[PDB]
Design a binder for these strands. Structure first.
Lengths: 241, 241, 241, 241, 241, 241
RNA sequence: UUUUUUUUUUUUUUUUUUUUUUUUUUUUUUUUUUUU
């Protein structure tokens, strides 16, 4: 009956396992087919509407019918136009459905750049983040930044980017979710660490191209070492409450 | 399909984003509507009644029907006269509605000045605040002070004003809300930091005019550096329980 | 629309605000009404019955019908005689109504002196308070003592009297209220600090006359500095659980 | 109206207050009523049965019908004989009713002496108490010991006896009451301090006679100073968890 | 009425109290009844079946009908044969009833020796106990060990054996009782300290014979001083969580 | 009656006890039944499907119907075929039923080898484990590793492997179980230590064969001493929160 | 001298939240609690 030893003695095929992990992957976040659906509904005006949807998701939220209740007449007409065109939903729906958070996650490059302008209009302001860590990087102030993180970066550097980004996520998750307010750092960390690592390890946008974005935003140097601003934020998360 | 890199490589238009944030803005509070409604119901006697309502909201509270139960005959007639004229409500109602807290928040300048006289009649007395931080600024002893804070001030100075003001808010929020009494500093901070930052970043009263008020109250010097009293209160909040 | 600056630029009238704070004060002014009602129902025998009501409120409680259930035949007749004459009630009723706690609060001078005799008959004994702070002042062992506290006293000294008195209130509030037993020092403090400060800042009995009582009880010296017994009790409250 | 100063200036009559406190006293315990009922049901064999009831309450508990379920045939007949004769009950009944705890509390002198023999048969053994404080006084190992404590003893000495006695109460109350196990020393203190002080300040057995018992048990010397064993137990309670 | 002083002045009869404590003892003294019942039901094959019942109670538990559900066909027949012969029960039944835990408790000498062989088959393994205290005594790894403890041993030595044994009980009680998992060291201690002390102070097996067993197991030396392994485990309980 | 001493004086037969522990063992024989059922449903294609089920259980989870909801068309396909063939269930079912966790536990050899390829796809990534302990062993990244642990290894070495493996289990159990997030290290340890020790002490795969696997994975040397990576992870668990 | 638990637990690019929260010279509890 002890024939499992022979099954274990078998040489592991690296690519045979790589085929099944991509097949049995946690699908739902879409990312690559978000752009496929954006051009399907939007057509030619998909780029202008995507820019509108990034500002909308960053300042207000993910639920479009809830934010429409407390909004201006000018906003009410523009938001409803996007819901009836792109068939936008709220929460975590199917693979073929679109949400405001999914549009911001797929176009992570434009989203991170928009955070420099939209600094004091976010649920967690830049001044609040500056209090925890002096001169906190504005580009890290959204969960979609995890899609811009290069996993090929060295261990100490990769952890320094993720720990600095987790400082915002700790504050942000407690603001948007009221039942996580009383819960400790470790309890809050367990809710955002899983979708964060999934966005870093996603095959969408190559390792070299992702590294170029981090250099352009002024997060890492020519080699890959993070800036003093990132290092201070990563150290602040270690002693955070 | 990976054409999102080209969309991300695009230079972000600062003013194009500024147009949409004002369009998709959160329709809440608005200090302009309060003054517009005060002159609509009051007429000419709106300034004298506003002075009465600021003192009423400072010493008693926001609920007018609840405070009327335990009040003198002189007060009962004057308070009911304001409810039937200005159509005053309790809690968080619609944009077209008025509350005692909204009147005190819109006219933040007069409210701040009234705290110097009404020091020992507040829920949190000046002597109690003096125990935590020696010679605590009396002008910071109301959540409406956030509307007098200048966001154009340097980072270190802007945080010093907000941290000093948060020392009162920590004590005040635990007094008016009984379920926040047992909860830690971080838990209490999360409830008042959001409407505080919204009042600082609000377009009502220019950055230069707001800076003049802080100088007049004796909080900041000719340049913008806060006084020793403000600096001690900001340091006290860092080590607060 | 930004005309609130002109309303704020107005010079604050100290006495105009002083008129409205007394008008919009909590209830239709206490203490004075109690003595006015005591002479109205009692007549000439009001002083002897007040002495009886002080001993009754200090040893038993505020509810007269509840304490009558577990009392001697001699007590049952004397207590019922006071209820039918002075129309005594239980809890927090209207301005024109009388309670055993209100009689003890109005005549704070006689109440504090009675605590020296009635030391081991209180819910919190003198021996129990002497364990927390060596030689705890017996005169502070009732919430009515707040009416004998002089607010004109220097900041450091005024806080020393209130912190020493709060050490008793922390123990007393947890004894009379069972749901406050499990709650921390900060949670218990928030329930008694509000009516305590209201009795200190009350206009009943002059600042100079109140200072004379504290000197007579042996709490403060000829100038206003509290005794070693008061200073030790104030320090004990800072490290109290 | 400020004529309360004249009422307060009056010299407090020690004896006049002493008359009303005994008149308006709270009834719950019995002491005199217990012995009156023991001779009423027992008659001549009341002294032999009281000795049996002290051993029964000390080793087993207060509930007689519950302890009979897990007892020998010899015990079952003797215990039931006491229930049918003295009409013994369980819990906190009326003044005219008797319980095993009330018999042990009324005859505190015999109960404390029985603890020397019944040392390892108690819920909290003498060896367990020796671990907390070396050579712990055996006479203090029952809540009925509070009835033997002399309140006329000096402050430092009176607190030393109560703090040493509370060391047992802290362990015992957590053993019999399972919901008090998780609660801190201060939370446990609040449940036993009220009936403890009531027994100390009770008029049953004079101050001089109570002092003689403490001297006979070897707790205090010829003057009133407690022994090294009591002093060590009082110091152990101050640092107890 | 104060005639209790005369009743207390009476000389306490050591043996008169000793008669009633044995009469009013807790029905659990089955140490004699178990062996008496094993000889009645089993007969001559009682010694072989007792050895089987010790291994069964140590590895599985005290519920014979519950453990039979998840067991081999060979075990199912042997276990059911013991239940139908000795009339074995589960839980806490009457005096003249037998349970797997009662058989292991009565024959404590064989049970403790079986723990050396059955080390990794217990609910709490020997390797787990070695992590808390290096080289933890295997003979102490069962609540029945309390019946092998000599109470005539010196105070410091007696406490060292009990504190070392309590380290296992703390780990064991939390494994078998799931609601005790979240509860602190003090809460768990209160549940096992009472039946532990009862087994130590039990008259079954003389003080000298009990001391010989502890010497034979290698727990105490020729005089009575415990080994370095026992001393380390007693120190580990003091700093345990 | 005290004849238990003679029964205890008897020399314990090591193998006589070894016969009864295997007879009165928990369950039938798990791990053996899994392979027996895999060949029963699978037949010849059981080895290829087992490799697919290992990758599926490691990356997603134990519930097959829940993970199918958020998966690709290619993924939804291969998973549903395995449920209808092997009759796969979710949770803790009967002995004759199969789960994804049971397949991974029985074939522990290939499961440990799959973790060097699938490091960043696990709920707890390798980079996260590297932060707690530098260069954490990738073969210890699953609860099924306990089945590869050799119990015949020396005490200090055996504890070093289990303490290093417990570092992952502490992080993993808090990720998959949300109510264990707030609970301390000791509370989380009590839930995984019991099934861990059961897999180490299990008779499936001999002690010598298990030792060969740990040498092949690069965990222990030629004798049995663990590597510096394992020693650092075991030390990290001792100071872990 | 009781409690006898079980290779289990499989969570999720989302939980997107609001210038709000306005509490009270009040609260007046009782030699009890007796667990295995």
């Amino acid at each position: 009956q002890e024939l499992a030893i022979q099954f274990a003695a078998q040489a592991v095929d690296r690519n045979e396992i790589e085929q099944w992990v991509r097949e049995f992957a946690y699908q739902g976040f879409d990312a690559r087919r978000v752009i496929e659906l954006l051009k399907q509904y939007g057509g030619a005006d998909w780029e202008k509407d995507a820019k509108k949807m990034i500002v909308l998701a960053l300042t207000r939220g993910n639920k479009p019918r809830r934010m429409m209740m407390k909004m201006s007449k000018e906003g009410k007409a523009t938001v409803e136009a996007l819901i009836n065109k792109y068939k936008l939903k709220e929460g975590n729906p199917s693979r073929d459905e679109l949400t405001l958070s999914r549009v911001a996650a797929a176009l992570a490059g434009r989203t991170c750049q928009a955070l420099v302008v939209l600094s004091e209009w976010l649920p967690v302001t830049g001044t609040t983040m500056d209090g925890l860590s002096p001169a906190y990087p504005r580009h890290m102030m959204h969960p979609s930044f995890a899609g811009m993180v290069d996993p090929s970066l060295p261990g100490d550097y990769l952890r320094a980017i993720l720990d600095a980004h987790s400082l915002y996520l700790l504050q942000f998750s407690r603001v948007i979710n009221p039942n996580l307010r009383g819960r400790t750092k470790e309890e809050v960390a367990a809710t955002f660490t899983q979708p964060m690592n999934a966005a870093v390890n996603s095959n969408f946008i190559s390792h070299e191209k992702r590294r170029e974005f981090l250099k352009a935003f002024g997060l890492v140097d020519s080699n890959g070492k993070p800036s003093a601003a990132v290092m201070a934020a990563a150290q602040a998360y270690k002693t955070a409450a």
